[PDB]
Design a binder for this molecule. Structure first.
Ligand SMILES: *[C@@H]1O[C@H](CO)[C@@H](O[C@@H]2O[C@H](CO)[C@@H](O[C@@H]3O[C@H](CO[C@H]4O[C@H](CO)[C@@H](O)[C@H](O)[C@@H]4O[C@@H]4O[C@H](CO)[C@@H](O)[C@H](O)[C@H]4NC(C)=O)[C@@H](O)[C@H](O[C@H]4O[C@H](CO)[C@@H](O)[C@H](O)[C@@H]4O[C@@H]4O[C@H](CO)[C@@H](O)[C@H](O)[C@H]4NC(C)=O)[C@@H]3O)[C@H](O)[C@H]2NC(C)=O)[C@H](O)[C@H]1NC(C)=O
Ligand SMILES: *[C@@H]1O[C@H](CO)[C@@H](O[C@@H]2O[C@H](CO)[C@@H](O[C@@H]3O[C@H](CO[C@H]4O[C@H](CO)[C@@H](O)[C@H](O)[C@@H]4O[C@@H]4O[C@H](CO)[C@@H](O)[C@H](O)[C@H]4NC(C)=O)[C@@H](O)[C@H](O[C@H]4O[C@H](CO)[C@@H](O)[C@H](O)[C@@H]4O[C@@H]4O[C@H](CO)[C@@H](O)[C@H](O)[C@H]4NC(C)=O)[C@@H]3O)[C@H](O)[C@H]2NC(C)=O)[C@H](O)[C@H]1NC(C)=O
Ligand SMILES: Nc1nc2c(ncn2[C@@H]2O[C@H](COP(=O)(O)OP(=O)(O)O)[C@@H](O)[C@H]2O)c(=O)[nH]1
Ligand SMILES: Nc1nc2c(ncn2[C@@H]2O[C@H](COP(=O)(O)OP(=O)(O)O)[C@@H](O)[C@H]2O)c(=O)[nH]1
Ligand SMILES: [Mn+2]
Ligand SMILES: [Mn+2]
Lengths: 467, 467
């Protein structure tokens, strides 16, 4: 047993006990306050609590690193990524393209870049599950009509041809077993659905992923994002130069403020303050474990007026942003190579940040969070979403398991017993989540701490010939 | 790295995050409430918080046991106590008593049994530090004219005679080096003070103790308590029979309610409810990790009227108590063997409980807590004191180290910067502790979470010839 592990475990324990002592005492006083005295005392209470909570979180961070846990988690996440990229690379590069089984994906989904890239991700995972080489058709891509290879490497070096002695539209892995070339539709219309879909992870990796990562579902998705966005030389250089021209250095927190056409249809308008309270909380947390010279935000937004508002409102922050990129994102110019490369850079710099604050309703932020998983052993928690939890559009049902019983106080709450399967719809970031107790057929609110994530697995191929 | 260790670390981490989400939302609601609606919602808040907090503490319990940590902690705590008892036993049993260096302690200190027992402990620790065999003089012991051996085994099998070619009163380890027999006074008057005093622990054991135990100072004291209280046969049998006749079985929580002459000069009167809120909270905590058939309290008190009050007020509790022992403890009849036997048994059963609720101002409770440390790997945290933190009367200055800065909000508070040495006077069990900032000469309140205990060491002998 390690001395620092044991000291830290006890300090976390004691810090939580003193937090409970503190709460009881202060809440008892609050009960006897009125008017402004109550609001003064409640605000001072919350200030004191935040620092206290962060001390506990900081000690838990240190506990994650003791006794070589940091070096090990890093080495094991490296091996898991090398192994999956090895297998993906093997599947995508057969010797004989003319005889290879293939899956054809068309990039041209009626949506934006994040949605299109996630369509390709979904095609790829199904290609990997069916041992079919992914063929990406990208001519007339609305963002770059020359296609994918305008920015990214081709998804194969040996097999980009879709020819085959037999071709058909997806009808299921069993029916298609002797169809050499299968055309896959968008997940929104896929029938029948195979099991090679999020949020499940490969059976053969599940136990190693749980040791390392707090949301293996995202890690698994992130491996296909990693392979897809391998840059062309010139895109690599453009990112290196942008990194230099902008002052992009750590520590930095990425903020994605999505507006324009999203507002009303798929998400709400969120004022800048809703993002920056979390940014400030997380610089306060970082400052407890490292020197913070200056507070840097990398701001990606499709509102080109925001940067001036943010700078004015938060003068102690250094905002790193390319406002011309933000202009490029207006619908007058969104579907152009100029705008495409802008969102690719914005996503890259969000992904590279130390923490991410955004709306997960936006595919852009999700892509950045997915990529972030490839830059750390476990970045599963390095985010705040103002609205949705992580999801992958088209995923199978995201179920939780109740670990503690719940008795509803209001009719907006659902009851739970341990073992009950809970279909989560969201976390409200207030202590409560929303979902359906599938056992009871009842939908409503439940305390987020009383459930556990249900990791789902699938028997994927293991590509042993890749070793 | 262990799957269960990592899952638990993340669930602790996430449980604390949801606790902070929960606090913010509910406090913001409370700010806008008045009157009874405020008190209803604040009481419901505190109920909700208690279960949430207990979930976090329960997960922290499980993390302490993962990956064989429990088996390891137990083996190492067993080895440490076998080693120290081996050394103490060696020191106490020289082959040649006539030539042995000796330290003479007189039990008849002007106080009660726990105080007299700690006087013997304090003599013993200095005896162990000076390589002198402890000679205990106990004739005319107020509790027993037969002496120590009325209840306990003699502290030596070979050397109980106090003879020597040279005898003197303590004058310091160096001056007394050629004095064969040194008479030690009470700690209240010991001058000059040697280093072999609480709360310091031996140099040679500290790194192992910090790995195993959350308060090494108490563990060290407990090793001498362990040796002293080896019972005579009749007392050993009395303890076994009382165990059966009282129905003493686990789970059980010990409660010591000290009144009579303690009240006013050395401690306050505390109503039974002040003890039982903690008793109930800790049965609620136990219930999260084991089935609790019946809630047993072992009640030790010198108030013979309390047991009937407790049973009436807490009818779902099973109170295990010996009211005739409590009657025997009255001031009028306190100092006789039957009463000595009573407090030895009461202390024994408090020590054997799963948790201890009492006033650490009472020497009776401190003995029980000390003995408890010998029955578990790390029972340093198995207690609630309504007043004092652990202390050993006569101890050297109990210092803490400030780890996080504090800016005082009121004139009741002291400032702290990291590294400041804090002489603690108490924990108020409300989030705040009381002490002196030695750097500044400032006395007052500080958040308890902003300090760390300062473990003190002393170069004691290691008695290698004992192996
Ligand atoms: C057209 O273009 C589209 C992009 O513009 C493109 O992408 C699609 O875009 C839509 C709109 O953004 C997006 O829909 C969202 O999907 C979220 C995921 O829903 C999943 O997973 C959640 C858990 O997170 C479950 O609760 C859902 O039921 C659903 O699971 C389904 O499960 C079944 C089995 O039970 C499976 O068979 C299905 O496969 C599976 N579906 C999917 C899609 O995987 C969902 O959370 C979003 O709902 C929220 O936003 C709505 C507004 O857009 C609100 O009306 C709704 O109430 C939700 O509000 C949230 O409520 C929470 C709880 O109170 C709060 O905490 C949140 O803050 C709050 N959020 C907001 C924003 O208010 C929403 O439905 C698709 O996922 C996405 N699809 C893909 C593939 O990318 C389309 O594909 C394009 N179509 C074409 C034909 O080209
Ligand atoms: C006569 O019989 C006695 C039997 O009762 C016998 O034993 C003595 O008994 C007394 C009374 O019970 C007992 O006094 C208590 O000692 C506590 C320990 O004091 C230590 O440690 C604390 C930290 O825990 C320090 O803050 C202290 O300053 C002191 O440290 C001293 O440090 C110096 C160097 O700095 C050393 O050189 C000294 O050796 C060292 N002193 C000692 C004694 O070791 C102490 O905490 C107790 O104080 C509290 O209770 C008092 C009432 O008894 C209150 O007046 C006082 O304000 C304290 O209140 C506490 O305040 C906290 C903060 O606000 C709260 O959290 C607490 O809830 C609150 N408690 C209560 C109960 O209200 C008290 O002084 C002796 O320790 C004990 N001595 C021995 C050796 O057993 C005598 O020896 C007999 N005499 C003779 C001649 O035979
Ligand atoms: N450069 C840049 N473009 C953006 C930003 N936000 C939105 N866009 C553009 O608007 C599109 C939104 O479509 P999509 O990626 O599917 O994300 P979603 O609509 O937010 O769910 C993006 O792909 C970009 O083309 C941003 O912060 N920076
Ligand atoms: N049997 C028994 N005796 C007690 C109890 N509380 C106090 N006494 C008696 O009162 C004495 C108190 O003296 P002491 O041990 O120095 O403890 P303190 O006064 O509480 O600090 C004890 O030794 C007992 O003789 C109790 O709960 N049970
Ligand atoms: Mn946060
Ligand atoms: Mn407690």
């Amino acid at each position: 047993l390690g001395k620092d592990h044991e000291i830290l475990r006890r300090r976390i324990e004691n810090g939580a006990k003193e937090l409970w002592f503190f709460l009881q005492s202060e809440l008892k006083k609050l009960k006897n306050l009125e008017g402004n005295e109550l609001q003064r005392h409640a605000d001072e209470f919350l200030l004191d609590l935040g620092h206290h909570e962060r001390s506990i979180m900081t000690d838990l961070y240190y506990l994650s690193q003791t006794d070589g846990a940091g070096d090990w988690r890093e080495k094991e996440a490296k091996d898991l990524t090398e192994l999956v990229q090895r297998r993906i690379t093997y599947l995508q590069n057969p010797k004989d393209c003319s005889k290879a089984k293939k899956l054809v994906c068309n990039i041209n989904k009626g949506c934006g870049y994040g949605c299109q890239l996630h369509h390709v991700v979904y095609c790829f995972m199904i290609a990997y599950g069916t041992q079919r080489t992914l063929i990406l058709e990208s001519q007339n891509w609305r963002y770059a009509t020359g296609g994918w290879e305008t920015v990214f490497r081709p998804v194969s070096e040996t097999c980009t041809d879709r020819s085959g002695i037999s071709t058909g539209h997806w009808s299921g892995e069993v029916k298609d077993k002797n169809v050499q070339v299968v055309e896959l539709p968008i997940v929104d219309s896929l029938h029948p659905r195979p099991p090679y879909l999020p949020l499940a992870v490969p059976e053969d990796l599940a136990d190693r992923l749980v040791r390392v990562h707090g949301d293996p579902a995202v890690w698994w998705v992130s491996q296909f994002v990693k392979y897809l966005i391998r840059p062309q030389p010139w895109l690599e250089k453009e990112i290196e130069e942008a990194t230099k021209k902008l002052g992009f250095k750590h520590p930095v927190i990425g903020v994605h403020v999505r507006r324009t056409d999203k507002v009303g249809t798929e998400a709400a308008f969120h004022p800048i303050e809703e993002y920056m309270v979390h940014v400030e909380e997380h610089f306060q947390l970082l400052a407890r474990r490292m020197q913070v010279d200056k507070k840097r935000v990398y701001l990606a937004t499709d509102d080109p007026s925001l940067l001036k508002e943010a700078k004015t409102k938060y003068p102690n922050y250094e905002f790193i942003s390319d406002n011309s990129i933000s202009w490029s994102a207006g619908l007058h110019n969104r579907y152009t190579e100029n705008s495409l490369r802008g969102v690719i850079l914005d996503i890259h710099f969000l992904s590279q940040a130390d923490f991410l604050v955004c709306t997960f309703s936006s595919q852009v932020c999700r892509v950045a969070y997915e990529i972030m998983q490839t830059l750390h052993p476990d970045a599963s928690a390095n985010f705040h979403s103002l609205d949705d939890i992580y999801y992958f559009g088209g995923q199978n049902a995201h179920n939780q398991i109740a670990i503690y019983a719940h008795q509803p106080r209001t009719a907006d709450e659902i009851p739970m017993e341990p073992g009950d399967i809970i279909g989560v719809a969201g976390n409200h970031w207030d202590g409560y989540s929303k979902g359906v107790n599938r056992k009871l057929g009842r939908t409503g609110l439940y305390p987020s701490y009383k459930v556990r994530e249900k990791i789902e697995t699938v028997k994927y191929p293991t590509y042993p010939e890749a070793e």
